[model samples]
Target chain A: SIKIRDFGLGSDLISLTNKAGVTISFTNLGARIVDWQKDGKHLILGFDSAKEYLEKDAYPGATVGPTAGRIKDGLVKISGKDYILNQNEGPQTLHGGEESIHTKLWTYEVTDLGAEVQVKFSLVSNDGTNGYPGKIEMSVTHSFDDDNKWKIHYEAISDKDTVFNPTGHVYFNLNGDASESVENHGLRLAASRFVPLKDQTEIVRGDIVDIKNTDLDFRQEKQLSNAFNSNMEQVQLVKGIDHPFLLDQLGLDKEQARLTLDDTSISVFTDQPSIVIFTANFGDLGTLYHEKKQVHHGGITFECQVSPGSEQIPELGDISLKAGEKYQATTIYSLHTKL
Target chain B: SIKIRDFGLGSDLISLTNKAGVTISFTNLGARIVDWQKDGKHLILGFDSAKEYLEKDAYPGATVGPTAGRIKDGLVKISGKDYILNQNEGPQTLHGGEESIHTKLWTYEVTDLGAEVQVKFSLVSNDGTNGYPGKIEMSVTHSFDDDNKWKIHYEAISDKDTVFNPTGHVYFNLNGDASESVENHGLRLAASRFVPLKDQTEIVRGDIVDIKNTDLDFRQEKQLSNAFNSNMEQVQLVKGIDHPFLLDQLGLDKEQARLTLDDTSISVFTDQPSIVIFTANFGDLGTLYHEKKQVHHGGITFECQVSPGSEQIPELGDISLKAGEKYQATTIYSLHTKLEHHHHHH
Candidate 1:
């Protein structure tokens, strides 16, 4: 088994390996994936290098909440009062904005698994970290199940009335290759319909449509090659699937299957309601990396969540929890060889 | 030919498409890509919906120059006097700051090949804007090629003896598929070495190293999978690749290829040796997208020009132009089918 350690304060990067000599390391310092290799062969997927992940990894491993998805107009009313969130993305409040818990450092503890490492990260977000209300005690645990699956469990409790939508932005390339696109990998979403976004340009709310005729559909296992082909309205909003997926109203249930991606070598399964799939298309943009080295590489991201800013969208189920309500959810990743 | 138009400029979803059925369309208005598909197919590559790019691109179709990159200590000297540029990024003067052309509007005209959008994004650093010298002329051009290629060209001539390093920051996703990741795309850079930063996390004139075997090496095609592994001393300094690349003297005049993403159907070739790449990792920390969107895709940016604060790095290269000297450089993109296939994978 491997053990990863980080100093409590700023996001830190540490490496933990498995019995097969496969290493899985991430830098909490920047919420980035640092290393994933088995016998010097690339097994992890996100970015090929720390510099690349630094230049890319938009929001990997960060807790995206307070309001996970979108909050319309950056305005929200809690208990008869109006509060404004950070509108960093043009005119809306996003994943906690510039001061989201995803960008903050957290305390952690490590445990041993069969061949994988289990680490727990915890932090308390104050009332105004990014214009959210109340203090939230949040904890995220990354564990490798006996089935060779990497599972992420998140639990949070707030003192005041607030919205909590935490997600894990982990980019997966089942082939264990960062350069090959994941389009060939078949995808199967358990959802029948998604919450459709109001505008074609906003990555906000969206309606879950049948993954049949429209490109927004991902009901059954289908190749991603033609998924983004149709001239559908939702497809144009983000140039990709940057919006949030509406869950099937599981009603705060645990261990529910959400999304799945499989290929010849591996299979990635998630038990969350909504998952945001973002392809690394910003390859031509300038990025700052290790000591400022600039390079480009494509990648894939899978974000598991309850909804995209469910709190802001009243019709998309319940995002607000009662004062003593427990904000808890489990996103399990069942990984196994396809052989 | 689908002409997607967006009239709303105030925080509205601005989407526009190409007139040529080629699925090429973008909006500086939102600094976002409404769609860039080929034959209406899903392409893996797309631009980063991160906060930094949006904030910077919000000044779209505008000229960014007269010291476009970064100016250390928020100041520079022409001849012997000190001049300060606007501090926009953090503590330094970034992309001309508030005085940049990005904040203004540019006149749009369709050229025979593609689109010729010109904007005079100029700023007058009267004694100081962020701490610069006299007034300067900054002009920027955003053009498109017939083959679905977008070009951002910058030209600036300062009246005062101020340092100048101009370049455009355009984020792209060649795959056209928003679901594909960039990690699998093979990348090859023409630079052999790059500039090291100073104590304040700025560029410093120093020795250039061969990118062979080092994490900074992009001289050969390789995946970006573990570039930040081990928290090497280098990664801790700049937070990421936000520095400059010193072009090899051999490829200095060759319009050396700087960036290539097979999955995005995009490749970046530039005449400037000093290029800066920023992986849009800021979103992982805390960056929101339109409608409170959570951005998880990292953007790869290729900025062509001299090192930031080049005036201070006398050893790196010259960033100052003489009284009548003209500054001209050509950056080209060599289209490839490999990248298209990469982006269309999923």
Candidate 2:
């Protein structure tokens, strides 16, 4: 077994094949990944080096917050009163009005598998803090499990009446090469109905929508080139697959499984209700390998959660926790040998 | 009715009393109401002329936002992960983390009773915008009724699961004068319990718990001076009654009833569930009668809304609405006879 260490800043990678022949590190701060393999293997995820990639502006590997998705009017009505929030996302309240968790500093702890980072933040939300209410207490924990799988946990409690919903935004590139696109990778999700957003183009949530016939479907592992077909409206909304899938389960006791691939296949399992699969769609945000030129790709954001719009549709299962309420969830990712 | 017009940007009497003799005018830019009068007389609730009374940082009228209140750690959790938020309030995330509605420009409309202002502002709140989720949309409306009352209505909606709470922070003095201290005003509240804050000293919700014998009691109409007994913890926390109170009725539906003070009394009527009463504990931030004076009493703010901290206590009632839900609220302020509001000089 190879020993791995994380500094909360990002993930560190080392190979068991060579004592010091190849090593890689990835940081979500700038969507940067650096791999220093033998002379024959040189892969960089849109950055000059591992050190340079972590110092960029992209929200590389951070947790999203307060209000992770989209708020239509920068305002929400609670009980019978209206509360106005912030519209940091081009006329809408996106990510927590711009100053969300993805852009802040976090504390870290190294472990056998990797490292765990934890942070504490709060929002009084006054009568209308970001259009929410009651001063709320929010806590987030990011950890890498023993199987070299990344795991994240979220928890929050409010003082009065309020809403609390957060999401994890982690981008991935199986090949670890920013210059190259993951179009050849295979993806699959065990979901039927999706929470289509207001725009039929987005996922809002209602039933087990089919994923076999339409491009939206990902029931079986398929190539990005085949699934994307062409740059369609839905794919264009987020530059790639940025929708949530309903995770069907046998019950609370049974866990669900998922899989992804590039040069190597990556399998994921979780005890949660849903997972969002996405591909980095940007074209020139990364670097081109030919002349060591700079480039860009929108990036992939695989978010795993309970439900997309649980706050609006309570019948689906209310994510709202009452006073003295505690919530727990877990997810695991393991690598498989294609050989 | 007397017309009061002033941008509250300078200290000029002529600028404060422009326009005809209209009685009320709420600035479109900052949902603030000026020249609230009865017929042709100036009610001047605890304030002086525009030139000497406009708040330095924010005067009679100013909208606030980003994070309305306070965020304990400026951090939140989403999908099993932790995220960080902006800390703009003294030590917490207040009024939308400092860049919110209160800080934006609002549109306006003129009505029979007064001028109405409507503001529309949105924030992406990205995956971690202010440590919250779901892109959010917020709208604020300020209107007035023929009954010489001003009303504020706020609304918000989101596509993803996120947290949202909005409110206003305004100071009021029934006397309508910025110079007079509300300490002598008589007041009463219709509440029985209050939500205590993390810092027991910061009042959140509930009613007159210790009112029976303590000076904080306002169950019956008592002089504002009596409530400010100087030795009370409330006075120590915020100088006066600065806590959220559970109104007498389910939605503060009580009609124009006596709430705050002057020599006589001013009646307050509202349909919100909670009331946050504050006395003009002016401190050193307020300007004296003239530039040559010392710090005097500040202004009082009686914020009416759903209970503070309602977001955490769902049992208190659902304070958050769905994506397509609607929100409504009303607050009415009226004046009575036997009172003359003036600029105090001591």
Candidate 3:
């Protein structure tokens, strides 16, 4: 059954449920998923107040971008001319900009495809919004099938040349509690190399190096703390994992990364060229349910998208959309329990 | 009086004392400076035994490189031909591979110039040593003048085109003690921009960014900890400071950086295109004079040279020595005192 309820502050909460006891709730504000439960156990981090979503520093469970991650100096040179963007993180532009797509209200339309329930959220940004040229029409579709697989399909088109890289910024803590850190959680990534950051500003330094013996290497499943306490400079830089691992294969059918917390596990499959694994090293600003503060390392985010700052580093992947050209990408989350 | 003593174990120690009450010591192994002092106070990090340097991780006070810093994947593509170099740091070649010039003892020649004492250390790399092509001849001359200035002059020539970027990897602590952290020391750089590392591997990502408002900005003198503890990711990456700042001017007469302690100060001048400032976030391994273990942030290195991997990024600076062409550069360290704390004596 699918239900739509008014989530205070003029926002709409769209809920979808499957026969396998999987239910997902999303708010029209930023097209953000407020909750995701498997057999009645919450699987993601969220806040109790819709207003708090409008005030928090961390983008909790929200759909983020026009361009995700940090863009060096908030300026991108396209076709030999420089396009300046809004700088929100000091001199850099982070996750779009100050007034990002994550903060805007999206319109939704629901559809029942027999074996699956799908909800599509749509929005349009006027030319030069956030200093990005072109009027872009974007849509993100969330679909859940009876098999308990949740997928996010994103598509967009611009009226002029512009950058577009989006991702679902969901902090997943399989334990269902934000108060508990995810230090014990085990993770594995099927990537041989990753794009390293210049610093904490999160700008990709355009070089892809191997992860074979380094702490960034996750070929073998291990506790998240192993990386957090690693002597590797990159690990020490952020105090935990905050790197974008390049996908071994770039296609929707490829499984990119896997995360497990005791009995519950989640496998992420994406068409994007990379997945940024970030251990929430910075504690959450908003209070979670029951007025509990989200502790550091509370959850981990597997943000699947084009390599960060791809618009600047052309070799990573192109995020430039030409007039009348459509941009499409898909990411799937397969959840299971008891191993 | 200047003294040249046999430090034994196949090495010679060259000691020079200037008219301004400053003394400097050097060794033939790696052409390394073992000590620098003002009134007999130790100002640089060093090991008691030259053999201990053969086992340490970080390059202490050695002259590093046929190429300093990391080369992407130990591979250099020259004129469409790929040359695989020796791998020292994982897949990358650091400080010129397994046996760098630092690990080799150089032939020395001492000359007594009018007001300066200079000792030149020279070495020759066979055509394929360290996997780098060309039979290259390199010389680094260390000179101490009457006015208390230490200068390093580097020159090299290769029979074939090859990458050549060398730097004096001397860790400086103005406090004159290796046991103390350099967090309290103040630093200032005359660079407006710097090269950003890709990650902890310390590979330059080929992007030059401005340091105007960022913690990488050392335009105004500030405590080194102000950058070490910065919330900025770059600062946090190495747990302290380690990044190459592009010199505001790339000429011999240009002042590159300035460092200050309570009473002592040192100003650096160089002709190199950049200077990599590194705070010893990782504790030192070698034991000091009194067997005191050097703790984290014990000393800082101001490595003046061509930008890291400049051979890969031509825009940074050209480090390729053409056949029969000479590569020359100079770096100067000017020491001072009697400011603030020392003014009390004045």
Candidate 4:
């Protein structure tokens, strides 16, 4: 079943509920999911009031795009024309500049598919809105299935040459309570190599290093605290794990990452080429969960998309979508629990 | 009388209803005045729902600071150290970057004094929070008196040498309907000189020019549409009037500007050195007034402060506050009807 209601700020709240006791509440502002529950247990870190999300710096459970992640120095060259975007972070553009899609209201349409319910959000960005050329029409469909699977499908078509890399920034804590640190949560990625970031800026350094003998290795399910406290230079740069793990290849419809906490577990399957795992290093400064502050490492985000700043690197998959080209990507998260 | 209620977003809505039938409502988030009403007539552009304020591009009744307006190229030279601030408005830093005080929750105290009501909001900005070095304590007081006067008092103290230029970005529409363009609204400023801005970027050119023989002149009360449609280069730069008019001097404590709409008029008195008059040219993108879209030139913001990027220009008044020095400024907006305006000044 699906329901819609007023979200208090000239915004509408939409919820998708299933018979399996799973509910997902979202708002049109940024097309952000504010709450997700499984069997009456809070499975994600969020705020009860949508207004708090506007005052904070974090993306929370929003779809960040036009281009997600950092763009080195807010510079981009497409077809020999240089474009400078808005810089919200220190010197670089983080999460698609200041006027990113996360700040705009998205048009939504809901549908009932019997055993599953889906909501599709659409947005149209005119040419030169954020220093990006071409008018782009994008759609993101979120579907909740009866088999305890949540799927996100992204599609876009641009009238001119432009970049499109959207990702879901949902912070998860399978422990049901965000007040407790997610350090005890176990995570495993099916990636043997990872990209390293520059110090302070966290921009991609343009190389993929092996995770064999380094602390960046996460092939085996290990406690997140182990990797977080390791004496690694990359770990110290961002204060915690904030690196992208390279998947086997593009168009691989297989399980890429798995997260476990006591009896509850989640497995992520995607056709994307990379998965950026960011441990919530900075605790929730302005967000309140159950009238308590969310502790550090309270949740971890597994962002499945193309590599960060792929437009500059030709070796990685190009995120530029020329006119008449269709861009599509899908990611599915499956949840399970042990009796 | 002063009333308080839960604002539904981890904030408190404080309302002050003076004996003169004028009421002002504010919120802790950004210490913003959401609404100002006179006898149930909306005199300002505001949103009934506090959450709607988050989606708008314009500051709109919010306290903009640490440093308001554009900081050239996001560069600041203080104590021989060049510090770079966050850039939210393209290349230049506007309204104190991304983590400005406008996005933080403020501590407020409300009080009632005889025939008037006052509310004070305070905030603490730690060192290096937004690439600035200082532990600053800032306060803004909004008081409504029985004499139809709404006064705003700003004060701050920093423990280190830092910049302090705060202003209230309140847009006023004396006609009570923001959907109608404010082009017909009459305005007059006591300033004889104004600062010109660079093209596109709107950065101050570090020079003051005379407003005489130019459309920038607002000495005589005239319709805003006249200045807005002028063929001046500065007017074309920002698509409308978005320039700062220089006052005679700092701490004048006299009438600075006046706005008129039909029978109602508002006179502004401030001790600040300059006032930036912004004609809402781009129209309200995300704001709704009376269930209608606010049109272009819907309201005008009279931002009284030191100057835009004053720290970089020696000619403008200095905005640097030392460790022990107190920084204070005041602005008073007095409203009058046809009888008063006719009896006082023609």
Q: TM-score winner among the candidates?
A: 4
DockQ of each: 0.01, 0.01, 0.00, 0.03
Of all true interface contacts, what fraction is found in model 4? 0.00
What is the TM-score of candidate 3? 0.49
Model 4: per-residue Cα lDDT over B1-346, one tens digit each: 7776655433567787777777888876677888888778888888765556655543788899889899987888776667776677887889987646775556566778877777888766654545565667788888888898888898888767877889999899976887787777778888889888866788888788898868778887777878888988888777788888998645546777888877788888888889998878874462577686787778899999888956556787776678767989888888887733422221
- The list of candidate 1 runs beyond 4 A from truth reads A3-11, A30-58, A113-116, A175-179, A200-211, A247-271, A286-297, A309-313, B1-346
Q: Output per-candidate TM-scores for chain A, rounded to 2 decimals.
A: 0.80, 0.70, 0.95, 0.95
What fraction of the reference structure's interface contacts does model 1 contain? 0.00
lDDT of 2 by residue, B86-190 (tens): 666555565456434443223232333233222222222333334555455555555544443455665666655545545556655554455556565566666
Question: What tens digits encode model 1's per-residue C-alpha lDDT throughout A1-339?
Answer: 554342222134556655445566765433334445544644434443433433464465555665665666677777777877767777777766643555433445567755656677665554443556555677777766444556677788876787777777665555555545556656665455666667743555434455545665566556666555546766655555555554444533343332334423334344456666666544455343223322222345567766664544556556666565787776655544444
Q: Which stretches of candidate 3 lie over 4 Å from their true place?
A: A1-339, B283-289, B339-346
Question: What's the lDDT for candidate 4?
Answer: 0.78
Native contact share for candidate 3: 0.00
Classified by CAPRI criteria, candidate 1 counts as incorrect
iRMS (Å) per candidate: 18.5, 17.5, 32.2, 12.4
lDDT of 3 by residue, A133-194 (tens): 66678999888888878899999998778889899998898878878888888888889887
